[PDB]
Amino acid sequence: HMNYETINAFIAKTIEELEGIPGITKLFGAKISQFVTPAVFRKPMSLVETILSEKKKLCLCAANKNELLCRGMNPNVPETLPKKIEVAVNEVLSSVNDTW
């Protein structure tokens, strides 16, 4: 159900989960909070494409070229980041949607 405890619990737990994905905090900084809103609760798997397009953009900035998500990943394996965001959002949703 879409109420105060759950909307709020979803938002913090999601931010916490995103800051838990190796690389995000160094690349995204304090701006990560801005990607999670009550709007995301309505379309949660939207986070997967919105964080990915921002990371791709952030990796162009000269200062971020030696950052993990930008060049530390094993190239010869499919990208974990989209799955990690998808798992994060679903795990939070379960934890939150199982109110009782």
Partner 1 sequence: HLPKPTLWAEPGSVITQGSPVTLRCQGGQETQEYRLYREKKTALWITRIPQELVKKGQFPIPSITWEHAGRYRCYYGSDTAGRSESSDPLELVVTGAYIKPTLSAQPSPVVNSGGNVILQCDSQVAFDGFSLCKEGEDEHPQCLNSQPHARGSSRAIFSVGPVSPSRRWWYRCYAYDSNSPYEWSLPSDLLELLVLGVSKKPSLSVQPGPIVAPEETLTLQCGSDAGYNRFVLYKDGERDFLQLAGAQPQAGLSQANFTLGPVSRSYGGQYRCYGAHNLSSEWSAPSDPLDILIAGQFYDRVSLSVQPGPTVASGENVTLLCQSQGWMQTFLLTKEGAADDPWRLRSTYQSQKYQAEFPMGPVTSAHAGTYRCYGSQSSKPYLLTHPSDPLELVVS
Chain residues binding partner 1 by CB under 8 A are 19-23, 25, 66-68, 71-74, 77, 80, 87
Under a CB-based contact definition with an 8 Å cutoff, are residues 23 and 72 in contact? yes
d(Cα 55, Cα 81) in Å, to the nearest integer?
Answer: 10
Residue (4 or 75) nearer to partner 1, CB: 75
Dump the DSSP string for 33-62.
GGG--HHHHHSTTHHHHHHHHHHHHHTTSG
Q: How far is the CB of 21 from partner 1 (least distance, A)?
A: 7
Residue (22 or 82) nearer to partner 1, CB: 22
Residue (9 or 23) nearer to partner 1, CB: 23
Q: How far is the CB of 72 from partner 1 (least distance, A)?
A: 4
Q: How far is the CB of 5 from partner 1 (least distance, A)?
A: 22
Go through 75-93 and write b for each residue having 16 or more CB atoms within 10 A of its CB, e for each that does not: eeeeeebeebbeebbeebb
Residue (26 or 42) nearer to partner 1, CB: 26
Q: How far is the CB of 2 from partner 1 (least distance, A)?
A: 25
Amino acid at 35: F
